[PDB]
């Protein structure tokens, strides 16, 4: 996900001024076992900035199994790498040995493909050289505008007396059983007894809670959920004479 949108200035920048567009965490490379992003980043740098494998009298050794008509290349030079028989480690290593087309006449990266980044936040140059480059990145369909929900109070469903679920229908979130177990494991009794009553089912609770909060009074004691009343009435409709009574004196439905 997009953590922070850094105002371009504070984001770390290359010595020519070019401020880097994204930063990805290093720790999420070795454990996940996808160094493709790093090779793609490097060959990305090789691709973005124009390059010329300063040939020699008769070719360099590292580019022995290298393709012809791919010694020189200009700026924004699009590259193809066949997924299983594309560019290699020793090819990339030498390739990073490129020209310096940055309008200035100094190279930004090194032979190891590690640029000496400047921290826009502090102002200092980072004590070790960072793996900068040009990774092709994709915006996925998982966007906050779809996934973000909020509901203090709104419309309730007709058949089920809990808030109708959905992003589109201005709906609340599902407080499931595994959520109730965690709440019980704490022993936040009143919390659970609020969530599974006035904050969901209870028709007198859901109307009173809003009034009570907006007036700024005590939250009235959650009576009985519709989810109990429906079970009671269901069992009464199944001809099972269920009745409520304490130690001394019997209660009424």
């Amino acid at each position: 996900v997009i953590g922070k949108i850094l105002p371009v200035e504070d984001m770390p920048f290359l010595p020519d001024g070019t401020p880097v567009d994204i930063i990805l965490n290093t720790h999420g490379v070795p454990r996940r076992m996808n160094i493709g992003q790093i090779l793609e980043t490097h060959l990305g740098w090789v691709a973005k900035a124009g390059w010329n494998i300063d040939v020699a009298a008769g070719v360099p050794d590292w580019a022995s199994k290298l393709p012809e008509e791919l010694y020189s290349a200009p700026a924004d030079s699009t590259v193809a790498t066949p997924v299983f028989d594309g560019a290699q480690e020793g090819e990339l290593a030498g390739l990073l040995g490129s020209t310096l087309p940055n309008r200035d006449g100094e190279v930004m990266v090194d032979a190891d493909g590690k640029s000496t980044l400047f921290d826009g936040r502090s102002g200092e140059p980072f004590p070790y050289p960072v793996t900068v480059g040009y990774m092709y990145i994709l915006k996925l369909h998982h966007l906050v505008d779809d996934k973000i929900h909020a509901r203090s109070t709104g419309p309730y469903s007709m058949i089920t007396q809990q808030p109708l679920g959905g992003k589109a229908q201005f709906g609340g979130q599902r407080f499931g059983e595994m959520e109730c177990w965690a709440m019980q494991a704490y022993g936040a009794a009143y919390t659970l007894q609020e969530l599974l009553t006035i904050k969901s089912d209870d028709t007198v609770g859901r109307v009173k809670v809003y009034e009570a909060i907006v007036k700024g009074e005590n939250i009235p004691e959650p009576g009985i959920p519709e989810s109990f009343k429906v079970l009671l009435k269901e069992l009464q409709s199944l001809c099972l004479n269920v009745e409520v009574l304490s130690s001394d004196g019997a209660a009424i439905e």
């Binding site: 022993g187 009143y190 700024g216 009074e217 005590n218």
Partner: protein
């Protein structure tokens, strides 16, 4: 046993509250009923005891008060 200073909800510190009430589970109701009382006072009408903040909440006042030992509780 120094923590420099607490901030927001973690003020006052819980370990100094756990000394006052029997258990956290008591302390909850301890604070909550007091807070419901403090809520009621603005509208049992006793408090606030300690000098409250300008825009401060009843829970903060209640949880401050228990730490000060201005209150006493009976376990049913």
């Amino acid at each position: 046993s120094a923590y420099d200073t607490p901030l927001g909800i973690t003020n006052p510190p819980i370990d100094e509250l756990l000394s006052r009430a029997s258990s956290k589970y008591a302390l909850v109701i301890y604070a909550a009923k007091r807070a419901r009382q403090i809520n009621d006072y603005y509208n049992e009408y006793v408090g606030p005891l300690v000098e409250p903040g300008l825009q401060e909440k009843p829970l903060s006042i209640a949880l401050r008060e228990i730490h000060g030992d201005l209150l006493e509780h009976t376990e049913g």
